[PDB]
């Protein structure tokens, strides 16, 4: 019942830049005021596009998500990760667990890319603590219940890193199970099933993904055992093997290799028909663009000289810093058609002045004309 | 002799969720009652679909197996695996075997995917202890006979992990040859030969598979030798080489890298014609869907605080848990045509109320209409 026309309008920001610490935001010792934000490639970027009113409805028929920074691979770690021993090729039986057996460990992350486009905020599933208490006593240290929660993805929320889509804040209390950038955050993963079931297609009418991972190391935990191994599955040892080793094993992910041929960005899209009833209409003059790109998550270290009066090198004369450069450039093609979210943090992008019908003057317009 | 019609009906569960320990089920010290089931990506999932009666016969012309959880790689191990020494790059001759020389070892598993669809339960071949005793005395510790057994695959049965399709329960008595999740189970592998020979095609009219593996390490055993090496094949040594090392070598598998491009799921199928006489007819108003997916077998560890009165970290204050999240969403397209299994454990799925002819309101229906 929506009538299409041959009127098109190109739009875009032409630049969107962000900078900050990749692990945690900076702030004063006890104050909650941020001095330097947290910016990394593991965070969703939800751009809430505020279109101009066509009556003073649009239809997003094309999009291009420019990325400018060089390809690179980020590194994340934890000074006090929980890692008892490596069991991939153990040659002697583990001897002691001790009071504290945490190690400074680093690791890359599951490479992942995605680009969700729709007229409604995206939906993300994770594994949080369950509600049902019923008539069961929560004994000291029992296993928390698990529940499949559904939320709305905001800018700044972390992505799945191969450790699983879970709410590490509550499910993990020791804060040593995963690297620093997610030890107290929520690693959501899009609920593609629900967002395509919805018959209208409002949550999205286009999406892409390309993620990969491999196990680079095999590690073990060190906490007290919960569900112990049944006596049936093994024969009791003696001597050195008298004390069992922990059977809680976790992998260290790795994204392998980054390439230009495996890039979904800097490439136009054509949303001629959606996978839902709605065919790209922008109800309410709004859009949401969620993008993840761990393929350019290179952290550039900075070194600053405290004093320049030293003839020889000294570690106590230089300060080490980490910062991450995030660059974006959104381009859109819109087609003319004739016929409550303030709780969340989005990256507002205003386009009410950046509309022009001179398609040929812009690259995306040239591509659209060619196709 | 079966007449086809232009009547179609979409159906689906819209959600199927499971949770539990990935290695072994939980239960009371000596009671056989389960508190937490065993759920992992190494288990077959046989969904026994109970269709409504068309007379109050269907023909499954399409299927889609949705998977929601993020890609990941599971890790399995054994606190007391039998592993004498690594022989890939040995630089000094092995010295001692000792009374017990088992080590805490971990390893990933052969990546494997499959999806069998048919009107009869699937068939699986393994390598079990043979029947024939005849006139041969079973001397103490002799080699058990081997036989190619055929069974029916049930939900909860393990898959081939690169250690071979065999009944580890009987063939291996020490319970230290393979990881904990299969040391007392049956790792079956589908008998594609027999299931396609059957002239009717009832056992299946569609199947897919994509499995891969590589040797990540080379290991040796430590038990007493059985069939000893012939004296012809080597020259007797002396000194350090006086005592031969075991010649029983086993590999540690590895599935390499998981990718979205290598996914057979979340993709529709069209069973226009089967490989057998039967062309997808659902005799008895039933179906079986066996699926394996080790590409999303990430185990999310949980940590719970016993006490919160400690200033410093202590391993004796946190309990470690392992759980696995299994998510499924089956969609089917059925076509109208006009013209004893209660011993096993299946995952019953009722569809007698979830039939609707509004194809466009569902994604699979939109895809079917497009094609």
């Amino acid at each position, epitope marked *: 019942y929506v009538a299409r026309t041959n009127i098109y309008y190109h739009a875009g920001t032409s630049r969107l830049l962000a900078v900050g610490h990749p692990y945690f935001p900076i702030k004063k010792p006890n104050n909650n005021k941020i001095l330097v934000p947290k910016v990394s490639g593991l965070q969703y970027r939800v751009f809430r596009i505020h279109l101009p009113d066509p009556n003073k409805v649009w239809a997003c028929v094309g999009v291009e998500v420019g990325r400018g920074q060089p390809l690179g691979v980020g590194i994340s770690g934890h000074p006090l990760l929980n890692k008892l021993d490596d069991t991939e090729n153990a040659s002697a039986y583990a*001897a*002691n*667990a*001790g*009071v504290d057996n945490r190690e400074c460990i680093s690791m890359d992350y599951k490479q992942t890319q995605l680009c969700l486009i729709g007229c409604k905020p995206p939906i993300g599933e994770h594994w949080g603590k369950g509600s049902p208490c019923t*008539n*069961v*006593a*929560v*004994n*000291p*240290g*029992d*296993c928390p219940p698990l529940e499949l929660i559904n939320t709305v993805i905001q800018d700044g929320d972390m992505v799945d890193t191969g450790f699983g889509a879970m709410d590490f804040t509550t499910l993990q209390a020791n804060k040593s199970e995963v690297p620093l950038d997610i030890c107290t955050s929520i690693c959501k993963y899009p609920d593609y099933i629900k967002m395509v079931s919805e018959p209208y297609g409002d949550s999205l009418f286009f999406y892409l993904r390309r993620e990969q991972m491999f196990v680079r190391h095999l590690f073990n935990r060190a906490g*007290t*055992v*919960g*569900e*112990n*191994v049944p*006596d049936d599955l093994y024969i*009791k*040892g*003696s001597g050195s*093997t*008298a*004390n*069992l080793a*922990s059977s809680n094993y976790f992998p260290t992910p790795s994204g392998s290799m980054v390439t230009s041929d495996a890039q979904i960005f800097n490439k136009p899209y054509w949303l001629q028909r959606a996978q839902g009833h709605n065919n790209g209409i922008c109800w309410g003059n709004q859009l949401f663009v969620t993008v993840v790109d761990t393929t350019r998550s290179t952290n550039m270290s900075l070194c600053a000289a405290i004093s320049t009066s030293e003839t020889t090198y000294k570690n106590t004369n230089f300060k080490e810093y980490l910062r991450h450069g995030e660059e974006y450039d959104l381009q859109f093609i819109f087609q003319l058609c004739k016929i409550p979210l303030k709780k969340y943090t989005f990256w507002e992008v205003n386009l009410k002045e950046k509309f022009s019908a001179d398609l040929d003057q812009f690259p995306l317009g040239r591509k659209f004309l060619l196709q | 002799y079966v007449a086809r019609t232009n009547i179609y009906y979409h159906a689906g569960t819209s959600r199927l969720l499971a949770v539990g320990h990935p290695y072994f089920p*939980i239960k*009371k*010290p*000596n*009671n056989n*009652k389960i508190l937490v089931p065993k759920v992992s990506g190494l288990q077959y999932r046989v969904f026994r679909i109970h269709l409504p009666d068309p007379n109050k016969v269907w023909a499954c012309v399409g299927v889609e197996v949705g998977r929601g959880q993020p890609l990941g790689v599971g890790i399995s191990g054994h606190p007391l695996l039998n592993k004498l020494d690594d022989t890939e790059n040995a630089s000094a001759y092995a010295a001692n075997a000792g009374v017990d020389n088992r080590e805490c070892i971990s390893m990933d598993y052969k990546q494997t995917q499959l999806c069998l669809i048919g009107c009869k339960p699937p068939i699986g071949e393994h390598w079990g202890k043979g029947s024939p005793c005849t006139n041969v005395a079973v001397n103490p510790g002799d080699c058990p006979p081997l036989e190619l057994i055929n069974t029916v695959i049930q939900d909860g049965d393990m898959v081939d992990t690169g250690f071979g399709a065999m009944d580890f329960t009987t063939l291996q008595a020490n319970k230290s040859e393979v990881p904990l999740d299969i040391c007392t189970s049956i790792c079956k592998y589908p008998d594609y030969i027999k299931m396609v020979s059957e002239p009717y095609g009832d056992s299946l009219f569609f199947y897919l598979r994509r499995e891969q593996m590589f040797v990540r390490h080379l290991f040796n055993r430590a038990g007493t030798v059985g069939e000893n090496v012939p004296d012809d094949l080597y020259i007797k040594g002396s000194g350090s080489t006086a005592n031969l090392a075991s010649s029983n070598y086993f590999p540690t598998p590895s599935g390499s890298m998981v990718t979205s491009d290598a996914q057979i799921f979340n993709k529709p199928y069209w069973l226009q014609r089967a490989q057998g006489h039967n062309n997808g007819i659902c005799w008895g108003n039933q179906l079986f869907v066996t699926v394996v997916d080790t590409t999303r077998s990430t185990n999310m560890s949980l940590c719970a605080a*016993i*006490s919160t*009165s400690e200033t410093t970290y*202590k*391993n*004796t*204050n946190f*309990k470690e*848990y392992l759980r696995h999240g299994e998510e499924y969403d089956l969609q089917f397209i059925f076509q109208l045509c006009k013209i004893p299994l209660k011993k096993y454990t299946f995952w019953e799925v009722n569809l007698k109320e979830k039939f609707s002819a509004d194809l466009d309101q569902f994604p699979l229906g939109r895809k079917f209409l497009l094609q």
Partner: antibody
Amino acid sequence: QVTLRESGPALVKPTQTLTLTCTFSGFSLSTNGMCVSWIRQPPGKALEWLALIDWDDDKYYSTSLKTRLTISKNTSKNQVVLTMTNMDPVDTATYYCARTYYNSNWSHWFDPWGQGTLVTVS
Amino acid sequence: SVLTQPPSVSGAPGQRVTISCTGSSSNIGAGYDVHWYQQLPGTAPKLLIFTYSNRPSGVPDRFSGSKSGTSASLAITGLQAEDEADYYCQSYDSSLRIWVFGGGTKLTVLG
């Protein structure tokens, strides 16, 4: 708060049947994770576990004395009854009733303890 | 008592004395938790620790413990007359398939 009280005969003749009853308040044997166990301590000797019953009514007994022991519970009356048969002078010991938490592990602990009722066999 | 404890240990006031509870591959080595109880002369046992170190309400922080393989230890800091009790360790044994206690140790102070 949660409390336990023991009651029963202080003197029982040999080869007879002893019966003991406990009364607990502040919790019920219907809540998951709640259990009750019986322990004994002969004079100048270490503690010895005897039996245990849980919310699902599953019962556990010491292997050395399994045949002689039986236990039961009454949720509506918050009482649990122990019965030992074929008594012997060696069994003269103090018996404590204690609440017990269920772990995902199998190593349960008994946080509260009763006063302890002494039993003599002669 | 399958679990073994020293019969008795003596310590000076204010000194850090320690206790040991040796086990085997069936009770402690298998991973089953360990718990402690203190029993004053003429009183019932009282819970002290319930997973190798944890402290219930009403116990001073000077009580702790750790896992050292097929053994567990109880550490007391600032020895006083309150610590003149008998201490017992407890755990689960898969072979005997029962819950077991130790031989108990009589802590004394050289006052």
